[model samples]
Target: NSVSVDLPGSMKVLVSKSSNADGKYDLIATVDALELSGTSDKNNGSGVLEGVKADASKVKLTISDDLGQTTLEVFKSDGSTLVSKKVTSKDKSSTEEKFNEKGELSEKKITRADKSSTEEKFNEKGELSEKKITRADKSSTEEKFNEKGELSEKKITRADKSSTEEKFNEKGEVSEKIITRADGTRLEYTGIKSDGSGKAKEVLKGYVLEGTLTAEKTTLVVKEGTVTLSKNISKSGEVSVELNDTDSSAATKKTAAWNSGTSTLTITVNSKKTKDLVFTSSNTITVQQYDSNGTSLEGSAVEITKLDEIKNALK
Candidate 1:
């Protein structure tokens, strides 16, 4: 069966034969007209590449220009739904973009002549969220983004089951960087200062109460399952928790201090006796106590990050 319909600028032609081995058709617009020709098969509602292959849910359109390059766009039955777009170059390289049914781009992939390519993904707002690049040797690097569309983290995975991850703190600073080797060991850098001089050489590695702490003397001691401690902090972020005596500033044996921007409270035991530190918060903090002689654990620190947990541990 052969059917032909010609319009001023667009034309559709259908030719179906029983050759079963091969079939062909031609709809050449010799003038300034448009042409569409595809094999109509017994298994499908047909077109050039055969629309949807079976049902009316999908349709494809392919256009080749005078340069022998082609662009293909596939869409759903609903005209507003664009499924994908693929453009093939003369060198056999191609780029394919897939959208989310009805909205933003879900993924876009580019393939080079060597068959190595990149894959890009977008968030709900069409922001670049993640990407993956593969080289010709099959090695790959994965990149992830933050809410501001910055490269928040990345991974260089290897075939040996180990990967190194680098985390970006700000727009341009790298913080808490961890370089993990294949043997499961890691060199981690925790804190990064904005000033270049504040170097975090040791890659390894606070709570208080509420309201005003001005009503009492800064003192410290521990007995009877409770700590009698009054702490005062200085303008320079140093804190002093005195003992039972008020005039022990010069003879002050131990001190506790902390600053903002960290989750730790340090208690320095300057004397040999067991010292105590008091704070004023119903919040959570990690307290690490050290001594002048390099002692390890005086009462071996509490092991939790909760207010109630600290209260119970201290008592």
Candidate 2:
């Protein structure tokens, strides 16, 4: 193919051709035009070059004039038109592009198809300032840039979640990503701007809970038993029990001090039923005692004026 340009200053012609079986230019085409500066009656005879085979599957042509250079990239797949990009060079360049795939541009931003559908906008400094990625879900993320060619904001929207605006600082640094999940988990990423050009070092490992406790006194208790005693001695941290044999005789008198911070309660009997009988028949005596929160008490003995108040109801 050939194009001819005719103007008052000068005329230019482009000629193209294809080689035949004998390696000769058999199919030749020409475009002839006038040359205003040259006053020749014969003018100019330009030979047209015809049937030039494409150098590559896709052809990208760049034409330049005093105005600027315009680039036309024709994308083809299987000799069929897939997409075409016409980018013109100007003070503020404009681009007209099309995607052959239908509905592909409407999909989610994560979809690669939307990447191909993007129309790029550049600033005066030739920096890409804006672009849109449309997804199948009719959601998109349109990214806008600042003067430094850094992304200033990204508006991301989806079907189930609310649209969010992620902003960046002047140094081309992401200051935060404010995300609100579909389940309403409002999350934010906040930190210092990482040096844009280096490997990060290990800062810290993890977190742990640690504590130290001091009590007025510590008490410890250890015992063995057959019947399981399910008691929560949380009020004053006193584990007290009274065991009686089958014949209704008090089996053992167990007294423990409140100087240590350990307590173990156990019961021993001939049979499980006998263990239950001992627990049900006799009174419960405090073996080891402490204050609430599992801490030991100050005194060794807590005087009780009347027995009826503690276990008198069982009698």
Candidate 3:
């Protein structure tokens, strides 16, 4: 006969019994029950039992709490343990396998540890194209692509912990990413230019004209018949002229001044809006070769004297 007992808020018993038809009682029966000291929730009171091989070579157990459940697999040799691990979660569903080499578990592989998940795909227009989901808990991962089938966005959600969203640029690079917590606050990162350079130049507010003519000073010589004028014009925004006449043969020593009628002052030539005024010709006085009541002038040719002055008067 054999017997086993287990308890986790409930009791379990397995027993094997032998019966004889000789109408005589025999000691071929077994019974199992939870000890009263093990009824309490303390670790020693309600501890789990993990059966181990006689060589202490392997051990397996399952445990549960309010938060989740866990399963453990341990490999041991001699008196020391080689490896031990406990996978845990609320759903507490997983698959694991171990391989043996020369009478020793050498490798372990775990796959499909959980059954609550789905995958979805969307096109450039945000239209869902494919969706696949498990029957339980329903964690999901979704992908969105552009018209050319390039990935544009991705979203991932796990059993009420957090949801993450990632946005990609046209080049299929992660331009922006956000990880939202259960309470809706999120952490984010935004992409920038790869070169770490400054902004490109842009057009300013005012107009910019190129290839304009500029000079420090330009002199325009206007010569009336038998008249000569010398003027200094500069870029300092001021002008002046000296006027004289060479036709003094008619009357020796006749001086000419600027003509107010013809000499118009302007910022630009012939610009009606900028015109200020015209300069008039100054009066010229001629010194006579002969003077009245002269005692037959000493020089026979009659010498003459002349004087001229420039005045600043506006027209």
Candidate 4:
């Protein structure tokens, strides 16, 4: 017959009865058997027991009075041992440690009273390989390392199921990052260069806006493959544009001004061709023409808006 008693505050006692000629009951393992008086005001109780192991060379347990700090150790016959320690603070912050057979720290976990926790994992070579952090809001970030013990990637998942992932290159530099929102919008950043340059692309509803960033300037090209519009802004506040269309003869220079206070960008087209061509971009394309002074030019100005229309006008 076997019996185990569970006490308050995570304490347990185990006993076994042997049906031999003597027919006597034997003590197997006691989680917190003996209690001794403490010394300081912070120390309330102490104990020692055999924890978890029921056979010879059972686990050794020690309980400290300072907020129930407990230590459990198990030694093998050949001197290799496994040990674990747990400490809890007054504010409910807790830490746990595990030692391998070689007496080296193998794993550690820390949990705060604010509902946040961090767990660290180590490889057999005693190298830190992975770490996970869970926040109070139920969001979590997980980090992984390569075989060389270098950080390879980090992934963050929010409570709303949105996530962001960052990958590192072999040189331990950030290679790319992808952010996926809950509403299905995705933004990706990649091709990071050494000169503080990178590329970012935002995708939504079949539309993509790709941007290139550099120390000297930033360029954004919209409508990637087909007839696209490209905008480039230099560090010195100069801006340029290239519209991929059949308007070779109508190659006009436009000036842009940025209002830092209002965060507004204004583009002005100045041409002395005596007629103004108005290009409208709604869901579709429309074109209108006006004379140099803003009056409608009717059949005077070339109605060149679409690529095909501009090509026809050029022909």
Candidate 1 per-residue lDDT over residues 193-272, each given as its tens digit: 45321111111112223212121322222321323333333323234443232234444434444443342334443343
> What TM-score, over all chains together, does every model reach?
0.40, 0.23, 0.22, 0.42
Off by over 4 Å in 4: 1-45, 52-57, 74-80, 89-91, 147-149, 159-161, 171-180, 183-315
Clashes of each: 8, 22, 6, 0
Alpha-carbon RMSD, each predicted model: 15.0, 24.3, 34.3, 12.0
Ranking by TM-score: 4, 1, 2, 3
What is the lDDT of every predicted structure here? 0.49, 0.37, 0.38, 0.56
> Can you write out model 2's per-residue Cα lDDT over 1-315, one digit (the tens) per residue?
422443211223332233333443222212122111111111122222222124443433433434243444444534345355455444323355544343112111111322334445654445566888666576767898777666788989786765666777876566555545454433333442453221111111121111111122111212233211222222233433333323333443222222223332322322211111111111223332334333343345322224332232122
Expressed as tens digits, the lDDT of each residue in 19-65 for candidate 3 is 32233112111112212111113221123334455555555444443
What does candidate 3 score on TM? Answer: 0.22
Top model number, TM-score: 4
Q: List ranges where model 1 is wrong by over 4 Å.
A: 1-37, 40-47, 53-56, 61-72, 89-91, 157-163, 170-315
**Count of backbone collisions within predicted model 2:** 22
- Pairwise lDDT winner, candidates 3 and 4: 4
Model 3 CA deviation exceeding 4 Å by range: 1-135, 191-315
Model 3: how far is 134 from its true place, Å?
6.2
Q: How many backbone clashes does candidate 3 have?
A: 6
CA displacement after TM-score superposition, residue 226 of candidate 2 (Å): 53
